[PDB]
């Protein structure tokens, strides 16, 4: 279908790799980038991990493991395992060498790579970071801040940071009104202050605005669904505006459409193409929502899977989104560079937006305007 | 999978 | 504390 | 000695 503003792909079917569907869940099958999928496979105490290398032909490396949780680095051949709440060990798979080894003061509830350099930890009470590649094997993670009370009684599902590693957001969900509500702790390290807000998804990104040259402004992108009314909302807002810059970002608020009877749905991931200024917002039930970043305008709504999504990641040099569904398909979406401008011009009937997107991305389709 | 995400 | 308008 | 994963 040649009008679609996106390309939709299956990167791999995990089930065709002999992997069991019993481990397709958020804790057991981890997905930090579209480079690797790590599956924790439980069979008695004869426990194991299957590492799928998406770059190298879906090659699986399988190892016995004594840990309860395992993640791969976004790019490097580095695996992180934790056990018994508090025991953490990180290895260079290639040399077999141990990068980090320590025992934490409090059990880890959630972890993920915040960047290529920094691993984030959330405990019952605390939020911690580790500069894993400092060459100090036994150096323990540094306290970032205590958890805000708004995250009490939630399941921790995300921890994100900006590139500068001085703004952060932790996301927890809980059942309210028989539906999923989300709570976010936002933390500014420079101010040493936290703020509690409502939401299910969060990401820090950057945008180049006319008249600021080649200097980005930073924006936070967050999406919520109200657990009582069902109303969905995306917000985009500036953080730490650099004063010399003459263009700044005016906050945007845009609807996220959920069918009223989509009782159990909520936003489950958000990823941004900084190059193209495109937000990808994915829901648990498999709905994809595209937004343009400058204007917050909704571009597209559709569904890419009928099976629920349980984990997601950036795709293709962070210009798209990838996800894994309950049937074990790894699915991917990114804009079609050749079709997105005609789509905006002619389907959305929106000349000004088409020119915004064409200009930012160097894309075709606006050359007869 | 016994998390709300998995439910 | 109100860091930002959300 | 102890490793959480057997490489």
Author numbering:
A (entry chain A): 1 to 369
B (entry chain M), D (entry chain G): 1 to 7
C (entry chain E): 2 to 7
How does the study describe this entry?
Crystal structure of Chc-NTD (displayed as a grey cartoon) bound to CBMs from Ent1 (1.75 Å, red), Ent2 (1.74 Å, yellow), Ent5 (Ent5.1 LIDL motif, 2.01 Å, green), Apl2.1 (Apl2.1 LLDLF motif, 2.75 Å, blue) and Yap1801 (1.95 Å, grey). For the Ent1 and Ent2 complexes, a water molecule bridges the interaction between the carbonyl oxygen at the motif’s +3 position and N64. Water-mediated interactions are also observed in the W-box between the NTD backbone (L24, D25 and V309) and the peptide at position +3, for both Ent1 and Ent2. Residue K284 within the W-box establishes salt bridges with the carboxy-terminal of Ent1, Ent2 and Yap1801. Mutation of the Clathrin box showed a reduction of almost seven-fold in the binding affinity to Ent1 (KDApp WT ≅ 138 µM vs. KDApp Cla ≅ 968 µM), while Ent2 exhibits a three-fold increase in its dissociation constant (KDApp Cla ≅ 509 µM). This data confirms Ent1’s binding preference towards the Clathrin box. Mutagenesis experiments conducted on clathrin binding sites revealed a consistent preference of Ent1 for the Clathrin box, with the Arrestin and W-boxes appearing to play a less critical role for Ent1, serving as secondary sites of interaction. Competition experiments conducted at sub saturating concentrations using native MS revealed that Ent1 is able to displace Ent2 but not vice versa. Here, we show that Ent1 binds more efficiently to Chc and therefore can be better recruited than Ent2.
